[PDB]
Design a binder for these strands. Structure first.
Ligand SMILES: [Mg+2]
Ligand SMILES: [Mg+2]
Ligand SMILES: [Mg+2]
Ligand SMILES: [Mg+2]
Ligand SMILES: [Mg+2]
Ligand SMILES: [Mg+2]
Ligand SMILES: [Mg+2]
Ligand SMILES: [Mg+2]
Ligand SMILES: [Mg+2]
Ligand SMILES: [Mg+2]
Ligand SMILES: [Mg+2]
Ligand SMILES: [Mg+2]
Ligand SMILES: [Mg+2]
Ligand SMILES: [Mg+2]
Ligand SMILES: [Mg+2]
Ligand SMILES: [Mg+2]
Ligand SMILES: [Mg+2]
Ligand SMILES: [Mg+2]
Ligand SMILES: [Mg+2]
Ligand SMILES: [Mg+2]
Ligand SMILES: [Mg+2]
Ligand SMILES: [Mg+2]
Ligand SMILES: [Mg+2]
Ligand SMILES: [Mg+2]
Ligand SMILES: [Mg+2]
Ligand SMILES: [Mg+2]
Ligand SMILES: [Mg+2]
Ligand SMILES: [Mg+2]
Ligand SMILES: [Mg+2]
Ligand SMILES: [Mg+2]
Ligand SMILES: [Mg+2]
Ligand SMILES: [Mg+2]
Ligand SMILES: [Mg+2]
Ligand SMILES: [Mg+2]
Ligand SMILES: [Mg+2]
Ligand SMILES: [Mg+2]
Ligand SMILES: [Mg+2]
Ligand SMILES: [Mg+2]
Ligand SMILES: [Mg+2]
Ligand SMILES: [Mg+2]
Ligand SMILES: [Mg+2]
Ligand SMILES: [Mg+2]
Ligand SMILES: [Mg+2]
Ligand SMILES: [Mg+2]
Ligand SMILES: [Mg+2]
Ligand SMILES: [Mg+2]
Ligand SMILES: [Mg+2]
Ligand SMILES: [Mg+2]
Ligand SMILES: [Mg+2]
Ligand SMILES: [Mg+2]
Ligand SMILES: [Mg+2]
Ligand SMILES: [Mg+2]
Ligand SMILES: [Mg+2]
Ligand SMILES: [Mg+2]
Ligand SMILES: [Mg+2]
Lengths: 105, 51, 187, 104, 147
RNA sequence: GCUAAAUACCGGCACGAGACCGAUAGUCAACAAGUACCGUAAGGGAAAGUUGAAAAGAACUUUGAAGAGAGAGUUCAAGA
RNA sequence: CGGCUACCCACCCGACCCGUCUUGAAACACGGACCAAGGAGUCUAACACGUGCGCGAGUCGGGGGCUACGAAAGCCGCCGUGGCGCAAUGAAGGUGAAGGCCGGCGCCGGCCGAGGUGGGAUCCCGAGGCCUUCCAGUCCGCCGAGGGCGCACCACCGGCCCGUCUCGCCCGCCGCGCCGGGGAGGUGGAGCACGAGCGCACGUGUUAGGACCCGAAAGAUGGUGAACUAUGCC
RNA sequence: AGGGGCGAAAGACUAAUCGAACCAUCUAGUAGCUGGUUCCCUCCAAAGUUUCCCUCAGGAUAGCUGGCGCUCUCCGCAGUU
RNA sequence: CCGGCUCGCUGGUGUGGAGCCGGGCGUGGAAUGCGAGUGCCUAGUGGGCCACUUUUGGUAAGCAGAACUGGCGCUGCGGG
RNA sequence: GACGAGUAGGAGGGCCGCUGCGGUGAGCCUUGAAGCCUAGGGCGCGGGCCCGGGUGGAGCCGCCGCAGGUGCAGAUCUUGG
């Protein structure tokens, strides 16, 4: 029985949603757990960078974001061979490598 | 404190963009405001004769 | 008994603000005294607009006050807005202004001061002018809120341009039956 | 399970409780529903009103001068009445002054 | 809070603010939007016109990035660049005009709505409206297209 | 065909906390509780906390067979 | 001696037992021996409206990261990605929101520049006047015939944007083409026409959830019974 | 062994349950139909009527009502003549 | 009412009509009474009944169905 | 100055009532708190509240804000007597 004026609504509560509901009461605890693991990792690799290896310059694919530059997955093999860095030693010295990247530019 | 919350004319140097909230009124002394010649001159005669 | 109907025997008008802001109540006290002890109705109108709620005093933009103070005759007057003076970015040159408002945004006041204006609150406005002489009282667009698009004659009715309540404007949402002359009828 | 069909008993009282108000007549009624050809003629007249401005201004100036020179060319009982005249504040001030002197 | 709700003042009244003749039953009018075509026809026609039926073509795999094209107006055009750019261009005597790269700001299409101040500009956008371009030409300026 | 990490946890071990509940409440169960008890069986399934600081739990006399009284005594208090 | 009130008794008047359904209840209508304890519009999400606060054409760290109560609190800004708003219309290809005047040959240079009318709270000017002996006389105020610029807002007339219909004449070229653009007049739009939104909190109403509390006749899934009884056999 | 068994056939018996046994779960199944719906005071104050519905014990929608206000005053309106 | 423009509509006729400006007239042009106007959210209701007069079916009905007004419902009090 | 009815229903004021939380009363309290009884003194229209007397032996309340599993005469209401 809808009222005089208002929206028509189609809530997705017709299933047994109460049986499967996730609550974030452990959010601060998980933040602390991530923080402690991150610090433990950082002190484990004493001189190595905390953020890990180095990732390449990459611009987003879609038209909406082709004017912005983000972080990449890894340096392409063509880029590595131009730089004179072996594909097996780059990861050892801390360079992210993924062989699937092409270079059309 | 001044570097934390900023001055009236200087914004906070440690916050990204913050400044002290401006007062809705400056001279809060209501009695002093009322008991001044400027306002009292432009007033009507009182009527304190209870009928 | 009496043949008196009490449907409207009680006025619905306000007598005090519905907010606990102490600064607003102090200004209310000041203008209460001025309204009851002066013969000028300007204070009474200011007192009423002080009593009015947030939505009844929409934020008057800088462009509106510039255009309204640009009218001939009211040169170097005092523009008084009971609401809020907000910065408007679609304007380049700001003349010297005499602004009296409850609050002005951080960059609007900077723009006016840079232009050479002066912003004074109501407590100092009373000292400058008890009766409000040499002042122009301005109000923002009270119908400017988006909710007024939904009010009036009901939608889906001939000669009624009312925005319907749609969860998402799009192709499939309330476009077929009552909107077209093909799928049934159109109003 | 029969029941009564139609009733109009309390409706008049319901109407008059809020009053059967006539529509609020307002000046300059809208022009919807008029003959489109006549409407087009009116819109064209309002569109081309601007060009006939200088002649209108001159005629208004001549009329104003005509009226300006025209205006230049043109340019119960007595005892109760007396007591009311005295009792009047503005016009009885001198009479009250004299009767005050008369008492002295 | 439940302290200020109406239920606190409904204690002592039998019907709890729901009527005595027609009791507050569970679902007297069906569940949700039931009977929109049958017994809620008046409401769904007086308040939701066009609700029933399909219209238009169907776009199966729709991606918002292809149609992504935010627009800006000429009144806000000068707001994108700093104030000192405009004042220096106005003060400039050699006739050099500032270049406004609206793409860097984040708008692809430029629409000409507001008054444009009398000052030469070079608007470097992705799309232009006819009135926007003619306003720029009329005020004195250039339009640069980029991909 | 293999592969940690970030991810899920009302079973289990050991923990900390609560704007929660306070013995008709809160788990069915604060106690010899999934016990007593019923059904052939699958299964169903309770009620039930408060002596006193310390038993100092009332020596001894008296009627009655005794239950149980009348004195006396312990205890700040047997109106514990 | 005073104490209406709270204990009992006596008298006069009134006085049918509560709840609920019903047009109509004290009803020969249903529930009700009495007492104690428990007991029924709560919570999540969405929307709308109104109110309070902050900021304001911006607004919001809700996710992540840095530093007993504290699982709090503060900070990030080249973590505002993203949501909402700032632009609508069309099914879509798409398009996407004032103009007028002057001089030269539809085009070039310059000027004015972002509607009009009626009602409009307030504000501005002022024909005179507000007396202490009387005259001229100034300064500070106050009232006022009349005249104005007119907030918000209402009504109408205009104008602009997108779809569509009709009548049309022009304009541009890197590829003069089944090319692209422009006018006037009607019409449809949840539009513009000098912002009003965003976040949080409160109240109300509706909805989906057990959804104010108790209540079925039923349906499905998986298991237990021939120790009574029905029947066959030994 | 349950929509199955068995019936010299009564829809009879199938553990006091048979025109479809018992137990647990789905399940707090749905109910336009009954019952109940908890403190005080103040103020305002109704309808059983129009239209539509496989609609008649119900709803949606107008009407009646309340609340919140807002724009003005010290011209307008009227169950009247 | 008085002048002056506009019109692509209609025309012998500055014809018709409409629109837009300017100017003037306050004894505020029946009585009486009353401060009005306007915008949002919204419960409950959607089984009625009775009475004067009008009136349909039925002989008639504390019958059934209509119209105006007033009541009961929602309402106590004095009288019957 | 005028007015005071009221079912369903709506709104407002509660220095009406219960539980817990943050503040606050140099708050109360074994020289006696909560609870309970009382032919006691009262106040407030009313929700209810403050003192007096008896039992009790260990916790309790006022004000400003916050939160709710917050008020019973019924429901062939549940448990117990
Ligand atoms: Mg309803
Ligand atoms: Mg990382
Ligand atoms: Mg009376
Ligand atoms: Mg009212
Ligand atoms: Mg009630
Ligand atoms: Mg009832
Ligand atoms: Mg109902
Ligand atoms: Mg409901
Ligand atoms: Mg049908
Ligand atoms: Mg694997
Ligand atoms: Mg902790
Ligand atoms: Mg117990
Ligand atoms: Mg107990
Ligand atoms: Mg228990
Ligand atoms: Mg017990
Ligand atoms: Mg005991
Ligand atoms: Mg006990
Ligand atoms: Mg004792
Ligand atoms: Mg004891
Ligand atoms: Mg009697
Ligand atoms: Mg009943
Ligand atoms: Mg019923
Ligand atoms: Mg009956
Ligand atoms: Mg009764
Ligand atoms: Mg009887
Ligand atoms: Mg009976
Ligand atoms: Mg019954
Ligand atoms: Mg009985
Ligand atoms: Mg109780
Ligand atoms: Mg609001
Ligand atoms: Mg969205
Ligand atoms: Mg609503
Ligand atoms: Mg609910
Ligand atoms: Mg059930
Ligand atoms: Mg079925
Ligand atoms: Mg056998
Ligand atoms: Mg078989
Ligand atoms: Mg048979
Ligand atoms: Mg069956
Ligand atoms: Mg239930
Ligand atoms: Mg009343
Ligand atoms: Mg029904
Ligand atoms: Mg309600
Ligand atoms: Mg009914
Ligand atoms: Mg009916
Ligand atoms: Mg009848
Ligand atoms: Mg009734
Ligand atoms: Mg009545
Ligand atoms: Mg009566
Ligand atoms: Mg008689
Ligand atoms: Mg009353
Ligand atoms: Mg609690
Ligand atoms: Mg007693
Ligand atoms: Mg002890
Ligand atoms: Mg009871």
């Amino acid at each position: 029985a809808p009222s005089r004026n208002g929206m028509i609504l189609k809530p997705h509560f017709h299933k047994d949603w109460q049986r499967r509901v996730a609550t974030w009461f452990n959010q601060p605890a998980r933040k602390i757990r991530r923080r402690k693991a991150r610090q433990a990792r950082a002190r484990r690799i004493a001189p190595r960078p905390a953020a890990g290896p180095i990732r390449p310059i990459v611009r987003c694919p879609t038209v909406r974001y082709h004017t912005k530059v983000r972080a990449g997955r890894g340096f392409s093999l063509e880029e590595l061979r131009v730089a004179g860095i072996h594909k097996k030693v780059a990861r050892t010295i801390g360079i992210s490598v993924d062989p699937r990247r092409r270079n059309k530019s | 404190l001044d570097d934390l919350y900023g001055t009236w004319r200087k914004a906070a140097s440690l916050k990204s963009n913050y400044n002290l909230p401006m007062h809705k009124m400056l001279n809060t002394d209501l009695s002093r405001i009322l008991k001044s010649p400027e306002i009292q001159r432009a007033l009507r005669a009182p009527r304190k004769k209870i009928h | 008994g009496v043949d008196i109907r009490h449907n409207k025997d009680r006025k619905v008008r306000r007598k005090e603000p519905k907010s606990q802001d102490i600064y607003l109540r102090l200004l209310v006290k000041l203008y209460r005294f001025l309204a009851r002890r002066t013969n000028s109705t300007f204070n009474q109108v200011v007192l009423k607009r002080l009593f009015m709620s947030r939505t009844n005093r929409p934020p008057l933009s800088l462009s509106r006050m510039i255009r309204k103070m640009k009218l001939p005759g009211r040169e170097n007057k005092t523009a008084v807005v009971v609401g809020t003076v907000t910065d408007d970015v679609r304007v380049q040159e700001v003349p010297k202004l005499k602004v009296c408002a409850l609050r002005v945004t951080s960059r609007a006041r900077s723009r006016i001061l840079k232009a050479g204006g002066k912003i004074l609150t109501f407590d100092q406005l009373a000292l400058d002018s008890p009766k409000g002489r040499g002042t122009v009282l301005l109000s923002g667009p009270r119908k400017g809120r988006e909710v007024y698009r939904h009010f009036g004659k009901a939608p889906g009715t001939p000669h009624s341009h009312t925005k319907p309540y749609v969860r998402s404007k799009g192709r499939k949402f309330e476009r077929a039956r009552g909107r077209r002359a093909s799928r049934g009828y159109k109003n | 399970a029969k029941s009564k069909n139609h009733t109009t008993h309390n409706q008049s009282r319901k109407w008059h409780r809020n009053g059967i108000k006539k529509p609020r007549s307002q000046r300059y009624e809208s022009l919807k529903g008029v003959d489109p050809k006549f409407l087009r003629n009116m819109r064209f007249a309002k569109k081309h009103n601007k060009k006939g401005l200088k002649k209108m201004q001159a005629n208004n100036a001549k009329a104003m001068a005509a009226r300006a020179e025209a205006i230049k060319a043109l340019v119960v009982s007595r005892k109760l009445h007396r007591l009311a005249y005295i009792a009047h504040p503005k016009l009885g001030r001198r009479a009250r002054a004299r009767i005050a002197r008369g008492l002295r | 809070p439940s302290r200020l709700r109406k239920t606190r003042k409904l204690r002592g009244h039998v019907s709890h603010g729901h009527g005595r003749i027609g009791k507050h039953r569970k679902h007297p009018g069906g569940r949700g939007n039931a009977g929109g075509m049958h017994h809620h026809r008046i409401n769904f026609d007086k308040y939701h016109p066009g609700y029933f039926g399909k219209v238009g073509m169907r776009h199966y795999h729709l991606k918002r990035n292809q149609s992504f094209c935010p627009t800006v107006n000429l009144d806000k055009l000068w707001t994108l660049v700093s104030e000192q750019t405009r004042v220096n261009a106005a003060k400039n005597k050699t006739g050099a005009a500032p270049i406004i790269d609206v793409v860097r700001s984040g708008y692809y299409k430029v629409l000409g709505k507001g008054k444009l101040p009398k000052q030469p500009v070079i608007v470097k956008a992705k799309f232009f409206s006819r009135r926007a371009e003619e306003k720029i030409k009329g005020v004195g300026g250039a339009c640069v297209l980029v991909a």
